């Protein structure tokens, strides 16, 4: 959630 | 960006910043993207999955700045937001990572071409650099793995281009790494994207043409050595991109 891949998501 | 250099909109002209509003009216920075044509827009899906809905968007182009309005800017709402019907999430290395955004303003026109805001190229069919290219990155994203805040000011830096069979060792990224995916990274491991870039150009100067090479998708951390920045190879999206450009 920190890094590249997981912008915009629900979980982070 | 991982060190590299400031820099303002001039210098990527084409570079689209994606914000999403939620409801009660907070607007947040979500993802970059490029200008490819006057009405489109190209990023990458894993930016938009998780909420797909295109009212909840807004695009701008011609802007160097976060959170503050740039001269000439111009403002959008998302027409249309396709995303790419094979797209996967594997740990992290997503398969087929790459979205397009129709744009239309409250005005309903497009983008108007300035000193900021211009396209950029796409590359012929399975058309790229030879590996060990220099290439640029763009994007809002993170300065430090464990920074809390973006950057207000754009940044740009340079990459180099590793070839498949370096991606794909074990003390890489192993099988993550697929041949419709480009790696790259800095010698020293010392630039990189980071978190916020996703969805951002990866341009490389192509028989004297910048074009756009790929699209910052994944990667382990950032700036960590092995294991570079993963881009989605545009070059073997070309039928997808011309066929979803006339919707």
């Given amino acids: 959630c920190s890094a590249r891949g997981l912008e915009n998501h629900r979980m982070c | ?247």
Wanted: some cysteine; glycine content about 8%; aromatic content about 10%.
């Fill in chain 2, 1 to 247: 960006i991982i060190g590299g250099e400031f820099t303002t909109i001039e210098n990527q002209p084409w570079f689209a910043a994606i914000y999403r509003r939620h409801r009660g009216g907070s607007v947040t920075y979500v993802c970059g993207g490029s200008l490819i044509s006057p009405c489109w827009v190209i990023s990458a899906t894993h930016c938009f999955i998780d909420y797909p809905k295109k009212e909840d968007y807004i695009v701008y182009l011609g802007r160097s700045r976060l959170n503050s309005n740039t001269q000439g800017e111009m403002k959008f709402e998302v027409e249309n937001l396709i995303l790419h019907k094979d797209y996967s999430a594997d740990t992290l290395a997503h398969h087929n990572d790459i979205a397009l955004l129709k744009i239309r303003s409250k005005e309903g026109r497009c983008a108007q071409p300035s000193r900021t805001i211009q396209t950029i190229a796409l590359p012929s069919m399975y058309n790229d650099p030879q590996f060990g290219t220099s290439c640029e990155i763009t994007g809002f994203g993170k300065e430090q793995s464990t920074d809390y805040l973006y950057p207000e000011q754009l940044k740009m830096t340079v990459v180099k281009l590793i070839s498949h069979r370096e991606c794909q060792q074990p003390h890489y990224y192993g099988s993550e790494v697929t041949t419709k995916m480009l790696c790259a990274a800095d010698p020293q491991w010392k630039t990189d994207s980071c978190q916020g870039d996703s969805g951002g150009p990866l341009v490389c100067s192509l028989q004297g043409r910048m074009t756009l090479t790929g699209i910052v998708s994944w990667g382990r951390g950032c700036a960590l050595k092995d294991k570079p920045g993963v881009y989605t190879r545009v070059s073997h999206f070309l039928p997808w991109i011309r066929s979803h450009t006339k919707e």
